[PDB]
Structures are given as C-alpha cells and as structure tokens.
Ligand binder design. Sequence first.
Ligand SMILES: Nc1ncnc2c1ncn2[C@@H]1O[C@H](COP(=O)(O)OP(=O)(O)O)[C@@H](O)[C@H]1O
Ligand SMILES: [Mg+2]
Ligand SMILES: [Mg+2]
Lengths: 180, 122
Amino acid sequence: GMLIAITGTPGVGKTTIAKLLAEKLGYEYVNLRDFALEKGCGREVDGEVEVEIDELAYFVEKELKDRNVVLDGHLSHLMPVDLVVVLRAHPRIIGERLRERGYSKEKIGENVEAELVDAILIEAIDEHENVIEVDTTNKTPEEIVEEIIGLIKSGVKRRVGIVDWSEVYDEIIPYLRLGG
Amino acid sequence: IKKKEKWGIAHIYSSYNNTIIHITDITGAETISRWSGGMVVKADRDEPSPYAAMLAARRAAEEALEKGIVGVHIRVRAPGGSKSKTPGPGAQAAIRALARAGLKIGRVEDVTPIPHDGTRPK
Ligand SMILES: Nc1ncnc2c1ncn2[C@@H]1O[C@H](COP(=O)(O)OP(=O)(O)O)[C@@H](O)[C@H]1O
Ligand SMILES: [Mg+2]
Ligand SMILES: [Mg+2]
C-alpha cells in the first residue's frame, strides 16, 4: 500500500490539496481528525478533539496498512506514513485565511509565526526521511497537485529548504504577536 | 529618586533556513531594529548558521543602542522536532551576542509557536 501524508500550517490548503490529489491519484481520502473520532482515540469537547498521538499512530498503522491513502491533517506527519508532503504559503496568506475563518488575533498570530519559522517542516524532517516541500504561493490547487504527482513520478523522495519566509518578514508584521 | 532606563523587546526567530532578530519598544508598535542572517552573510548555506545569528544580533543590538535602548526582554521562537526536541544553539547564541554588544538582558520567554486547529494533541 501507499500512504501519503499532507501536512502544513492551518490555512495552507491541506484539505483542498488532499481531496484533489486523492481523486487524481485514484487513492482514497482520509481526514485524520474524523478517523481519530471513529477509532475512539478522539474525544470531542466544545468543540475541539483531544487525542493521544501514539494511539493514533497505532491505529493508522493497523487499519490503513495495506491501502492507498491520502491522509489529511496537521498531525499527519507524526503518523507512520511512506511519504510526507509539507505545504508552504506566504504567512500573510495564512493570516488572511485564518482571519476569514474567525480565529482569534492571538491564534492567527501563532499560526502565522508557525509558518514563518517552518515548524511543521522541522517536525516532518525529524520524523521522516521522505519529505517533499511544496510552495503553494500564487498556484492553483491543480498546479500544486500536478507538481506533487510529477515529483512522485520522478521519483523524488526528499526535497526540503525551498522557502525562506524571513525575506518577507516585514509584510507579515501586522499578524504577529509583538505586543508588550 | 534614582530611576532611568528605556527597555525594548527582542523577538528572536530561529527557523530552518534563517534567523531573525527584531527589536521593538515595550509597546511593540515601533520597530527599533530588524536583522536576519540573510542580511549579514554572502552564502545561502551560511544563513541558518549560529555565527550568522550572532552577527545579525550584533548589528541589531548596535542599532538599538544607538537609538537609546538600554536593555531588552527576549521572546524566543525556537522550533525543534517532535521526536528529539532540538531548538539549536542559534537563539541562545543570538541572546549572548545581544549581551556582548552592551545590551542588558531582561526576562527570557520561550514563545515558540505551536500550529493549531484540527485534532488536538497532548
Ligand atoms: N491553491 C489554492 N489557491 C487558492 N485558494 C486556496 C488554495 N488552497 C486552499 N485555498 C483556500 O484556502 C482556504 C483553506 O484551505 P484548506 O484546504 O481548508 O486549508 P487547510 O486544510 O490546510 O486548513 C479554503 O477556503 C480554500 O478555498
Ligand atoms: Mg484542513
Ligand atoms: Mg534565502
């Protein structure tokens, strides 16, 4: 089986890209949160869902083993997958999107900073050898998916270090948590 | 009455590709100094280097001092892996460089950002 993880900062487009990719690849889409709820790992309290990661990794290993799956979630790179795809975007884009979602100023700020410092990418590289980083900036989901499939078909198992958001730092200052 | 001094905030970002030192005033509205590894070194491969972090911190601290900042509180963003949590020597090296440049060091807080919403981990 082939298990592909799609991760990155909230708002970056994980779900969009995962659905389109799973359809185009002929794989099956699995949202990690819902899967966590089904196996009884996840408990949903008003309205967030708390899970224990080792359990979720256990179940993912058990059930999906064995399958062709595009796994969607910001925890997906912590799962025992074959390949990790880390989506990146200009942190201002993250800020605007999370702003449209109705997140708090502090939460928006933390996730924008999270994209600024490459948090997810660093986690992924720590967890897996096979990690493909993709910049979503100024791209359609179509272009992004064809880029990913193209790299897999090359095949390239590892590409990292393709964005440095420090260069755009000033542009994202309005979203950051700088307040005394 | 013996009292003096003007204090800032040094926001320190340690990423995969770089380091940023952004010094503001205590309110955080005004930018005193802004420096990154990419501004002080020639080669891309040296941008993540702790030496570059130290040099950038040196420039930032100098600029801040000339503008009247006596000391800074530090707010550090230093992501590390989920398996091994290794923030790297960079942020600390930057802080030391700030001190050596003549800045006083205040409170040091680790504000390292945790991306969230979706499933919630413990
Ligand atoms: N490549 C893209 N181009 C334009 N808009 C996008 C793209 N990818 C995602 N979006 C938009 O961003 C928003 C969040 O995308 P989503 O897939 O929910 O991100 P995530 O799953 O990472 O939280 C959606 O409203 C979607 O329309
Ligand atoms: Mg999503
Ligand atoms: Mg660069």
